[PDB]
Amino acid sequence: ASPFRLASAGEISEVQGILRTAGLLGPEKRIAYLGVLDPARGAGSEAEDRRFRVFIHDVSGARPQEVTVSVTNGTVISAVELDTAATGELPVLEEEFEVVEQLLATDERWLKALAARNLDVSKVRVAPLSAGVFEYAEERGRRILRGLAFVQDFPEDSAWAHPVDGLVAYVDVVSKEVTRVIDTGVFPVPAEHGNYTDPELTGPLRTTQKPISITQPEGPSFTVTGGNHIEWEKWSLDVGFDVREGVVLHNIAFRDGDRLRPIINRASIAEMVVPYGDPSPIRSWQNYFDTGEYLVGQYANSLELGCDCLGDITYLSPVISDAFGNPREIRNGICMHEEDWGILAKHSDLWSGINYTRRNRRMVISFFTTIGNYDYGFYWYLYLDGTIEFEAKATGVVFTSAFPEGGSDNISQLAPGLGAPFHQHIFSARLDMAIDGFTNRVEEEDVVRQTMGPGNERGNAFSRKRTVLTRESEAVREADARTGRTWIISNPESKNRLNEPVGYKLHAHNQPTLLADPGSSIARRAAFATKDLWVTRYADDERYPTGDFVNQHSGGAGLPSYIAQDRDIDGQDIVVWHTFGLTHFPRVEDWPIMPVDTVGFKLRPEGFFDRSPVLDVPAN
Amino acid sequence: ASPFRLASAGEISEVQGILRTAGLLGPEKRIAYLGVLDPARGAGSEAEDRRFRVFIHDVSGARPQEVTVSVTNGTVISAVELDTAATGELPVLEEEFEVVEQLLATDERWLKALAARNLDVSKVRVAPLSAGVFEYAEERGRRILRGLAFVQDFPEDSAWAHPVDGLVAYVDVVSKEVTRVIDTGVFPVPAEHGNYTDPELTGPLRTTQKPISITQPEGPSFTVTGGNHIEWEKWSLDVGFDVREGVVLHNIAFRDGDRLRPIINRASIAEMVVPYGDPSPIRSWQNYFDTGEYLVGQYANSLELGCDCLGDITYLSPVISDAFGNPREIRNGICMHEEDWGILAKHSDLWSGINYTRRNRRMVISFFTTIGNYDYGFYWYLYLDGTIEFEAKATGVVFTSAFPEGGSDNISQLAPGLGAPFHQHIFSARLDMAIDGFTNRVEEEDVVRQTMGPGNERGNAFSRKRTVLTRESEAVREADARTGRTWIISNPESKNRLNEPVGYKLHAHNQPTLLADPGSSIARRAAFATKDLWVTRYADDERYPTGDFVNQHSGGAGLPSYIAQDRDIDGQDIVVWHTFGLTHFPRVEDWPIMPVDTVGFKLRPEGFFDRSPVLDVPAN
Ligand SMILES: O=CCc1ccccc1
Ligand SMILES: O=CCc1ccccc1
Ligand SMILES: [Cu+2]
Ligand SMILES: [Cu+2]
Ligand code: NA
Ligand code: NA
Ligand code: NA
Ligand code: NA
Instruction: Report helix, strand or coil for A49.
Output: coil
> Could you give the CA distance from residue B229 to residue A496 in angstroms, rounded to a whole number?
52
Those residues whose C-beta lies under 8 Å from the C-beta of residue A396, and which sit 6 or more positions away, are A370, A373, A374, A375, A376, A593, A594, B346, B347
Give domain limits for chain B. 1-87, 94-195, 196-619
User: Which DSSP string corresponds to A505-541?
Assistant: EEEE-------S-TTSHHHHHTGGGGSSEEEEE--TT
DSSP notation for B412-444: EEEETTEEEE-EEEEEEEEEEE-TTSS-BEEEE
Nearest CA to ligand 1 atom 6: A372
The answer to whether residues A381 and A364 touch, using CB atoms and an 8 Å cutoff, is: yes
Q: Which residues contact B560 (CB under 8 A, 6 or more apart)?
A: B527
Instruction: Supply angle C-alpha B600, B367, B228, rounded to 5.
Output: 110
H or E segment to which residue B76 belongs? strand B75-81
The H-assigned helical ranges of B65-178 are 84-87, 99-104, 108-116
CA distance B423 to A461: 9
Count CB neighbours of B36 within 10 A.
Answer: 22
Nearest protein Cα to ligand 2, atom 7: B372
Pocket of ligand 1 (CB under 6 A): A 127-129, 288, 290, 294, 371-374
3-state secondary structure of A615: coil
Q: Determine contact, residues A495/A429, Cβ cutoff 8 Å.
A: no
- Distance of alpha carbon A147 from alpha carbon A125, whole angstroms: 9
Q: What is the CATH code of the structural domain delimited by A196-619?
A: 2.70.98.20
Catalytic choice (A33, A374, A504, A544)? A374
Q: What is the DSSP letter of A21?
A: H
Q: Which amino acid is at A253?
A: A
Q: Which residues pair with A267 in a beta bridge?
A: A249, A431
CB B239 within 8 A of CB B413: no
Distances, alpha carbon A499 to alpha carbons A495, A607, B348, B588, in Å: 5, 10, 54, 12
Which ligand 2 atom is nearest residue B274's CA? 1
Closest ligand by atom to B83 CA: 7
Same CATH fold, B94-195 and B1-87?
Answer: yes
Burial code (b: 16+ CB inside 10 Å, e: under 16) for B350-363 equals: ebbeeebbbbbbbb
Determine the 3-state secondary structure of A617 from DSSP.
coil
Final resolution, Å = 1.9
Distance between CA atoms of residues B130 and B145, nearest Å: 5
Q: What angle do CA B376, A479, B518 make, to 5 degrees?
A: 60
Q: Give the active site residue among B242, B278, B290, B532.
A: B290
Please tell me whether B292 is known to bind a ligand: yes
Contact A176, A139 (CB under 8 A): no
Catalytic residue from among B33, B276, B374, B562: B374
Asked: is B1-87 a CATH 3.10.450.40 domain? The reply is yes
- The H-or-E segment that residue B242 falls in is strand B235-242
Query: Which spans in A69-165 are helix H?
Result: 84-87, 99-104, 108-116
DSSP B519-582: TSHHHHHTGGGGSSEEEEE--TT---TT-S--TT--S--SHHHHHTT--B-TTB-EEEEEEEEE
For residue B481, list chain A residues with Cβ-Cβ distance below 8 A. Answer: 479, 481-482, 510-512
Binding residues of A for Cu cation: 423, 425, 584
The region, left, alpha or beta by phi > 0 then psi within -120 to 50, assigned to residue A199 is: alpha
In 3D, which of A21, A51, A22 has the Cα closest to residue A37? A51
Whether B277 lines ligand 2, by a CB cut-off of 6 Å, is no
Length of chain A: 620
Q: Which of B467, B469, B465 has its CA nearest to residue B440?
A: B469
**A599 and A580 in contact (C-beta within 8 Å)?**
yes
In this complex, do B460 and A348 lie within 8 Å of one another by their Cβ atoms? no
CA atoms within 13 A on the CB side of B549: 22
Is CATH 3.10.450.40 the right assignment for the domain spanning A94-195?
yes
Q: How far is CA B59 from the centre of its chain?
A: 28
Mutate to test the interface with A, among B125, B218, B410, B458 (most CBs of A within 10 A): B458
Task: Compute the distance from residue A432 Cα to the ligand 6 centre, in Å.
Answer: 4
C-alpha to C-alpha distance for B610 and A562, rounded to whole angstroms:
48
* Residue-wise burial string across B430-453, b where 16 or more C-beta atoms lie within 10 A, e elsewhere: bbbbbbbebbbbbbbbbbbbbebe
Q: How many CB atoms are located within 10 Å of the residue B324 CB?
A: 12
**Exposed/middle/buried for residue A75 (C-beta within 10 Å: 0-12, 13-18, 19+):** exposed
